[PDB]
Amino acid sequence: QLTPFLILLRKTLEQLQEKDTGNIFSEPVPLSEVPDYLDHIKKPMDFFTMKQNLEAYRYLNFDDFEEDFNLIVSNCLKYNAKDTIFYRAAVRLREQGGAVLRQARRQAE
């Protein structure tokens, strides 16, 4: 049901954000500091934006939620060179966030 699902997602988002130990993915990539970001990235995403989306009832299924998480990672791997803190952090988040989502999905099913 909807209310239990939304409770699950809120907890899941909290746990995903907990894996961002560099605090690298918790606000939008700042265009004032990374001015060419939108030359390469179609749809920016970050955990604050996901929280706004969650609280506005925009994630009513697990796939839509997981897709936005996957964008946080994919965008970062795409934009940044391999030998950067950003790329390395995204690879780690993919692994550790992946684990959180697998557990959450087992709960939702």
Residues of this chain that interact with ligand 9F9 (CB under 6 A) are 23-25, 27, 29-30, 33-34, 76, 79-80, 86
Minimum CB separation of residue 108 from ligand 9F9 in Å reads 27
By CB atoms closer than 10 A (0-12, 13-18, 19+), residue 23 is exposed
Q: Cα(88)–Cα(80) distance, rounded to whole angstroms?
A: 9
Whichever of 23 and 107 has its CB closer to ligand 9F9, that residue is 23
Whichever of 80 and 96 has its CB closer to ligand 9F9, that residue is 80
CB atoms within 10 A of CB 35: 9
Whichever of 25 and 62 has its CB closer to ligand 9F9, that residue is 25
Minimum CB separation of residue 30 from ligand 9F9 in Å reads 4
Residue type, 7: I
Phi-psi region of 23 (alpha: psi -120 to 50; beta: other; left: phi over 0): left
CB atoms within 10 A of CB 81: 7
Whichever of 62 and 69 has its CB closer to ligand 9F9, that residue is 69
Minimum CB separation of residue 25 from ligand 9F9 in Å reads 6
